[PDB]
């Protein structure tokens, strides 16, 4: 089977160099064009460029020609994508992909899993979990909204669950927003019955693996 | 270079009905020697890589369902889902491979179309833990609504806020096909303690007039 194993997700700063890889296997590495595709957060696919490892001959598009360098190694069957100086605009998903047919240009098939490159001047920081408490003006025998505010952290991701994963119905963990400071902020909310607020206990379970942070914050009425 | 322009940017089709995703290239993709249109379609489902759906304009891959089909020639092209299903929710991209660079289209986000649902609006003041640490975030939840388009405006003592409020929208829910939205108004503790009244005014198609949930500070 054809596989395109890529390197792990990177967290860098502006000015630093980086070299993401793509270890190819299950085909003749020299005989196919192999390339890279950018996808920024909540955006479309951008064709960066391709390389033919038979003679190291490359192609680029005008946005990425001058900005990056696509190379390859025949002995280890590994294509690369090199930055000499990263910027904050380069924070994106970087898919690797072989061209679908040998000895010619074409459509991409198969694709790699992708490499999350993140570039920011902010350093690693764990979140502060603040309770979005349920309202005292919640309707008697109605629905009541409550949640947690996972404020000020870096890098992504954070995994929120309620009551050690017991409370799944009506839960909405929102995607994070990059604040002016450079630290991400996220919200997670759950809608429940108004009658349940007295008896039932609601605890969000925030986990941020980069800072080794694990918080169990109790959300309750005033 | 060749520019690829899909139509529409976002498409909402009901379950069972026909989905039509177009793709217009700047110059022609048909080559008259072999009579082959050099166009490929892609399917990128949420949180996955792009998968090859169709190559050569009208040749799907092995494993692709019969409901999917690719048509058109020269400049104009079309991807056709004859009967939409729940699994088909994805961002679809066309791509020319006639001349290098082999550019993609901007992409067509395909969502499920359901009946109009107004949001259950809620408002949350800054907690006592956050005010102790020295800041103030006011969250406004809009829960379970369709369609995606919803306006949130923050008011503090009836004065319209601007440039100090970031929002976040979830993806479409697998069970009920609705969206949710969480707008967060960030102020300093000094700016929080000055003003009394706080309100988010939500506007939506399902709502008859713009609903306004609110609170008074220290109550």
């Amino acid at each position: 089977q054809v596989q395109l194993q890529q390197s792990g997700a990177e967290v860098k700063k502006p000015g630093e160099s980086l070299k993401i890889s793509c270890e190819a296997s299950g085909y003749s590495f020299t005989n196919y064009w192999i390339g890279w595709v950018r996808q920024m957060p909540g955006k479309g696919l951008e064709w960066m460029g391709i390389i033919y490892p038979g003679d190291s001959d490359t192609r680029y598009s005008p946005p990425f020609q001058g900005q990056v360098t696509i190379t390859a190694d025949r002995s280890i069957t590994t294509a690369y994508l090199e930055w000499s100086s990263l910027k904050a605009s380069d924070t994106a998903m970087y898919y690797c992909a072989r061209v679908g047919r040998p000895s010619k240009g074409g459509w991409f098939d198969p694709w790699g899993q992708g490499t999350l490159v993140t570039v920011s001047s902010a350093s690693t920081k764990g979140p502060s979990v603040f309770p979005l408490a349920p309202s005292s003006k919640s309707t008697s025998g109605g629905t009541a909204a409550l949640g947690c505010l996972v404020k000020d952290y870096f890098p992504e991701p954070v995994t929120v669950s309620w009551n050690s994963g017991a409370l799944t119905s009506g839960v909405h963990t929102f995607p994070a927003v990059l604040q002016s400071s450079g630290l991400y902020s996220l919200s997670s909310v759950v809608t429940v019955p108004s009658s349940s607020l007295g008896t039932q206990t609601y605890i969000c379970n925030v986990n941020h693996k980069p800072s080794n942070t694990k918080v169990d914050k109790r959300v309750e009425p005033k | 270079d060749i520019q690829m322009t899909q139509s529409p940017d976002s498409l909402a089709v009901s379950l069972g009905e026909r989905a039509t995703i177009n793709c217009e290239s700047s110059q022609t993709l048909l080559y008259r020697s072999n009579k082959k249109n050099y166009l490929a379609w892609y399917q990128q489902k949420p949180g996955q890589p792009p998968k090859l759906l169709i190559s050569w304009a009208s040749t799907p891959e092995s494993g692709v369902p019969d409901r999917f089909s690719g048509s058109g020639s020269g400049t104009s092209f079309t991807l056709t889902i004859s009967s939409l299903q729940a699994e088909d929710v994805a961002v679809y991209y066309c791509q020319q491979y006639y001349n290098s660079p082999y550019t993609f289209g901007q992409g067509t986000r395909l969502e499920i179309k359901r009946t109009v649902a107004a949001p259950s609006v809620f408002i949350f003041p800054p907690s006592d833990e956050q005010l102790k640490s020295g800041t103030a975030s006011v969250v406004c939840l809009l829960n379970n609504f369709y369609p995606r388009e919803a306006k949130v405006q923050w008011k503090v003592d009836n004065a319209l806020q601007s440039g100090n409020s970031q929002e976040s929208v979830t993806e479409q829910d697998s069970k009920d096909s609705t969206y949710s939205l969480s707008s967060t108004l960030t102020l300093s503790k000094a700016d929080y303690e000055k003003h009394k009244v706080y309100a988010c005014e939500v506007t939506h198609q399902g709502l008859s007039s713009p609903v306004t949930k609110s609170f008074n500070r220290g109550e």
């Binding site: 033919y52 040998p102 240009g105 074409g106 | 020697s33 006639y98 290098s100």
Partner: peptide, 13 residues
């Protein structure tokens, strides 16, 4: 009017 994939980007086999 030939495509670059077949001509300029094509290689030996």
């Amino acid at each position: 009017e030939e495509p670059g994939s077949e001509t300029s980007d094509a290689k030996s086999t």
